[PDB]
Structures are given as structure tokens and as C-alpha cells.
Design an enzyme around this catalytic site. Sequence first.
Site, PDB file in Angstrom:
ATOM      1  N   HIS A  69     -26.755 126.778 -49.565  1.00  0.00           N
ATOM      2  CA  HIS A  69     -28.053 126.617 -50.221  1.00  0.00           C
ATOM      3  C   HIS A  69     -28.523 125.175 -49.940  1.00  0.00           C
ATOM      4  CE1 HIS A  69     -27.379 130.304 -52.838  1.00  0.00           C
ATOM      5  NE2 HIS A  69     -28.204 130.409 -51.819  1.00  0.00           N
ATOM      6  N   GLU A  72     -28.874 121.840 -52.391  1.00  0.00           N
ATOM      7  CA  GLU A  72     -27.751 121.403 -53.202  1.00  0.00           C
ATOM      8  C   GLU A  72     -27.036 120.224 -52.549  1.00  0.00           C
ATOM      9  OE1 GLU A  72     -27.585 125.923 -54.856  1.00  0.00           O
ATOM     10  OE2 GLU A  72     -25.832 125.503 -53.855  1.00  0.00           O
ATOM     11  N   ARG A 127     -34.161 126.351 -50.592  1.00  0.00           N
ATOM     12  CA  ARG A 127     -32.877 127.009 -50.831  1.00  0.00           C
ATOM     13  C   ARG A 127     -32.434 127.919 -49.676  1.00  0.00           C
ATOM     14  NH1 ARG A 127     -29.843 129.334 -54.994  1.00  0.00           N
ATOM     15  NH2 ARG A 127     -29.411 131.619 -54.944  1.00  0.00           N
ATOM     16  N   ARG A 145     -27.166 136.016 -50.783  1.00  0.00           N
ATOM     17  CA  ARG A 145     -27.475 137.360 -51.264  1.00  0.00           C
ATOM     18  C   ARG A 145     -27.442 138.336 -50.086  1.00  0.00           C
ATOM     19  NH1 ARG A 145     -28.333 134.710 -56.528  1.00  0.00           N
ATOM     20  NH2 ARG A 145     -26.584 133.987 -55.261  1.00  0.00           N
ATOM     21  N   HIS A 196     -21.175 125.292 -54.329  1.00  0.00           N
ATOM     22  CA  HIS A 196     -22.566 125.132 -54.702  1.00  0.00           C
ATOM     23  C   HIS A 196     -22.767 124.002 -55.726  1.00  0.00           C
ATOM     24  CE1 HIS A 196     -23.982 129.271 -53.368  1.00  0.00           C
ATOM     25  NE2 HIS A 196     -22.736 129.066 -52.956  1.00  0.00           N
ATOM     26  N   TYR A 198     -25.658 123.374 -59.426  1.00  0.00           N
ATOM     27  CA  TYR A 198     -25.037 122.568 -60.455  1.00  0.00           C
ATOM     28  C   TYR A 198     -24.771 123.597 -61.545  1.00  0.00           C
ATOM     29  CZ  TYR A 198     -29.982 122.604 -62.258  1.00  0.00           C
ATOM     30  OH  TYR A 198     -31.302 122.766 -62.668  1.00  0.00           O
ATOM     31  N   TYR A 248     -24.900 134.571 -64.002  1.00  0.00           N
ATOM     32  CA  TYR A 248     -25.762 135.713 -64.074  1.00  0.00           C
ATOM     33  C   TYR A 248     -25.366 136.703 -63.001  1.00  0.00           C
ATOM     34  CZ  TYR A 248     -27.930 132.540 -60.665  1.00  0.00           C
ATOM     35  OH  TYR A 248     -28.116 131.561 -59.686  1.00  0.00           O
ATOM     36  N   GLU A 270     -19.464 125.390 -58.962  1.00  0.00           N
ATOM     37  CA  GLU A 270     -20.810 124.886 -59.225  1.00  0.00           C
ATOM     38  C   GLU A 270     -20.626 123.445 -59.684  1.00  0.00           C
ATOM     39  OE1 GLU A 270     -22.416 128.291 -58.075  1.00  0.00           O
ATOM     40  OE2 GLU A 270     -23.722 126.719 -58.609  1.00  0.00           O
TER      41      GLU A 270
HETATM   42  C1  ZAF Z   1     -31.271 130.591 -57.773  1.00  0.00           C
HETATM   43  C2  ZAF Z   1     -30.976 129.520 -58.843  1.00  0.00           C
HETATM   44  N1  ZAF Z   1     -32.173 128.934 -59.341  1.00  0.00           N
HETATM   45  C3  ZAF Z   1     -32.304 128.101 -60.377  1.00  0.00           C
HETATM   46  O1  ZAF Z   1     -33.408 127.701 -60.617  1.00  0.00           O
HETATM   47  O2  ZAF Z   1     -31.233 127.781 -61.090  1.00  0.00           O
HETATM   48  C4  ZAF Z   1     -31.433 127.447 -62.440  1.00  0.00           C
HETATM   49  C5  ZAF Z   1     -30.303 127.459 -63.326  1.00  0.00           C
HETATM   50  C6  ZAF Z   1     -29.966 126.359 -64.033  1.00  0.00           C
HETATM   51  C7  ZAF Z   1     -28.904 126.401 -64.863  1.00  0.00           C
HETATM   52  C8  ZAF Z   1     -28.200 127.538 -65.014  1.00  0.00           C
HETATM   53  C9  ZAF Z   1     -28.536 128.633 -64.306  1.00  0.00           C
HETATM   54  C10 ZAF Z   1     -29.599 128.599 -63.479  1.00  0.00           C
HETATM   55  C11 ZAF Z   1     -30.029 128.594 -58.293  1.00  0.00           C
HETATM   56  O3  ZAF Z   1     -30.303 127.750 -57.496  1.00  0.00           O
HETATM   57  N2  ZAF Z   1     -28.776 128.730 -58.746  1.00  0.00           N
HETATM   58  C12 ZAF Z   1     -27.754 127.752 -58.595  1.00  0.00           C
HETATM   59  C13 ZAF Z   1     -27.230 127.506 -60.031  1.00  0.00           C
HETATM   60  P1  ZAF Z   1     -26.604 128.319 -57.426  1.00  0.00           P
HETATM   61  O4  ZAF Z   1     -27.341 128.592 -56.089  1.00  0.00           O
HETATM   62  O5  ZAF Z   1     -25.497 127.242 -57.395  1.00  0.00           O
HETATM   63  O6  ZAF Z   1     -25.944 129.762 -58.022  1.00  0.00           O
HETATM   64  C14 ZAF Z   1     -25.089 130.564 -57.170  1.00  0.00           C
HETATM   65  C15 ZAF Z   1     -24.170 131.512 -57.949  1.00  0.00           C
HETATM   66  C16 ZAF Z   1     -23.410 132.516 -57.268  1.00  0.00           C
HETATM   67  C17 ZAF Z   1     -22.152 132.265 -56.835  1.00  0.00           C
HETATM   68  C18 ZAF Z   1     -21.460 133.223 -56.180  1.00  0.00           C
HETATM   69  C19 ZAF Z   1     -21.993 134.450 -56.000  1.00  0.00           C
HETATM   70  C20 ZAF Z   1     -23.236 134.713 -56.460  1.00  0.00           C
HETATM   71  C21 ZAF Z   1     -23.946 133.741 -57.075  1.00  0.00           C
HETATM   72  C22 ZAF Z   1     -26.066 131.343 -56.455  1.00  0.00           C
HETATM   73  O7  ZAF Z   1     -27.127 131.627 -56.913  1.00  0.00           O
HETATM   74  O8  ZAF Z   1     -25.727 131.729 -55.251  1.00  0.00           O
HETATM   75 ZN    ZN Z   2     -26.310 127.637 -54.459  1.00  0.00          ZN
END
Ligand code: ZAF
Ligand code: ZN
Length: 307
Positions: A69, A72, A127, A145, A196, A198, A248, A270
Site C-alpha cells: 500500500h 504507508e 494506496r 484485495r 502495513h 497504522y 474489519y 499494522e
Molecule cells: C483502507 C483503509 N483506509 C483507512 O482509511 O483506514 C482507516 C482506519 C483507521 C483506523 C482503523 C481502521 C481504519 C486503510 O488504509 N487501512 C489500513 C489500516 P491498512 O491498509 O494497513 O489495512 C490492511 C488490513 C488487512 C490486512 C490483511 C488482510 C486484509 C486486510 C488492509 O486494508 O489491507
Molecule cells: Zn495497508
Amino acid sequence: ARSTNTFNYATYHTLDEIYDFMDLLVAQHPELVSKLQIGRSYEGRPIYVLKFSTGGSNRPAIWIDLGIHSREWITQATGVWFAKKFTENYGQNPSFTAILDSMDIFLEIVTNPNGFAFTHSENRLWRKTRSVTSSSLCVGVDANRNWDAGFGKAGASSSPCSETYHGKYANSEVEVKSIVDFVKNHGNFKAFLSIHSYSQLLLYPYGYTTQSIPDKTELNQVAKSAVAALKSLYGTSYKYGSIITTIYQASGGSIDWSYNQGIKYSFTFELRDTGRYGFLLPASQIIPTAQETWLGVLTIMEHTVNN
Ligand SMILES: C[C@H](NC(=O)OCc1ccccc1)C(=O)N[C@@H](C)P(=O)(O)O[C@@H](Cc1ccccc1)C(=O)O
Ligand SMILES: [Zn+2]
């Protein structure tokens, strides 16, 4: 910049600076590390993986990728510090030396090079990948994804303009398919870690279903142990648990795919923080972050050696 001892690990770099550091590190340690090209990105950039190896045939291996991503930025910065750290500790730390004497480590610092360029040239919070096709004037697929585990199910979006867009079909992104091919052709990976940022979480399989993995007791315990080693340095608190449960629902994520290929030790970290800075972590947190996540990653590798 012409010695990896002169390199500034406490700042954020561009793609050119990172691929030059890879060349300096290999030239400094040619018996321990080599640079492999496992593909090219959508726009034509080489995709590089560093192999750290003490010898042997088809040693059991550890995969670690960072930056899938592109916004990050703590993760590509942590991976540069990891690479340097493995050539510093090998032969000095008993634990790390014992892992590399029986296993190889593959390290991919920039998994999505076109996206990472874009975060420098135009949009810091990009991203996705950079592919264009067809049906939309919106660029890019969410490469976490696009893997063939629950692909297309809830936990990913089907509009091209979404940040979570899954792609037309699994492994459509060459950045993903390059890793899938490489891991399969190797055929002897024991652990798969994808980093990844945070939220300060240590996550294991599944994101696409609420069903517990058969190995959930053992991975929950390794995660308990890694999270306590990490906290030991600076007090940084992590939570841990399955993806779907601890942040999630997400379908098509890499760690669900690797686990379903039989790589049991499949985890995503994370990294720092929990919201104050988000993707825009200060450069003064790079090395603290890198140093305590080292401790959590060492704890997982040690457990993969011993089993
Ligand atoms: C898409 C998302 N957008 C966002 O705005 O995040 C907000 C957020 C803040 C705090 C908590 C949760 C979400 C985002 O960037 N998520 C990150 C937290 P990240 O990209 O690290 O999350 C990962 C989690 C993951 C890990 C393994 C398999 C499936 C999913 C992901 O979305 O790929
Ligand atoms: Zn990520």
C-alpha cells in the site's frame, strides 16, 4: 549514498534512493545478500527482492514484504532498516545467526513501486497500484484485495474508483502475480509476513470469513509472544487477533492466500501510530518503530525455526 553506513535511515527516501541502497548493501555483503528481480510493475519498473542466505539447497524460507500500500511510508522505511540490520546482526546475535544458518529470508521493500512513485510525484495518500484499463477513468487496484482467498467477497469494493477496489479477477495485478509465482516456484516458504501501517496491530488469518483457522491457538500464542517482545523496548502497545475480528472484514488479502497455500505462519503487522499522525508518521519515529518491530518479527522467526 556511497556506503550503507552513511545512509540516513532516519529520513524518508524516494524509489531511486532505495534501489541504490539495495545495490550498495549487496556490494558490501555479496556472500550474505543478493538482489533478485521477480518482475516488473504495471508501468515498467523492476520489482526487486533481496535474498539473505548463508548457503544450502532449498532452505526453508521467510517472506517479508513492505509497501504493498504505497502511502504507508513507515513500512518501506522500516524495510531499509531491516535489510541493514540483518547484515549487522548476523554473526553477532545468537538468535538471528541461528535462523539464517538454517533458513533464507526474502525481503521485498517496495511491493508496489508505481504507487510509491505517485505518492512522491502527485498524491501522498495514494494506496493502489497504477493500472489503467477499460472501463473507468479511475486508476488502480487495491493490491491487498487482489489475492485468491475469498476474492470478490464482502470486504472489498467492485467500483474501480474505490480505494479497496479488488480488480477484475484475482492476481490481475502484476505486482501481486509476481509474488504468487515466485512463492509457488520456490515451494518451501514457512512464514509469510506482510507489513502495513497504522493501528499497531498484529493480525493473523482470516479477513474474508469469521471462521477460525485450524491453527488459531498456536498463531494466537505466537502473536501474544511477539507483541510482548515488541512492547519491551519503548512500551508500545499492540493488539492482536484475526483480521476480521481485530480491524474489519477484508477479502482477497495476501495473508489469507498464503495461509491457504499451507504457509502456516502468516501474519500482517499494522505499524505505528494509532491515529494521531496516521500515514503521515514523523521521520523521528522511523527508527524507534523499526527497532521494536524487529523484536516482534524476530520472535516469529524463532518460532518458525523451532517448528
Ligand atoms: C483502507 C483503509 N483506509 C483507512 O482509511 O483506514 C482507516 C482506519 C483507521 C483506523 C482503523 C481502521 C481504519 C486503510 O488504509 N487501512 C489500513 C489500516 P491498512 O491498509 O494497513 O489495512 C490492511 C488490513 C488487512 C490486512 C490483511 C488482510 C486484509 C486486510 C488492509 O486494508 O489491507
Ligand atoms: Zn495497508
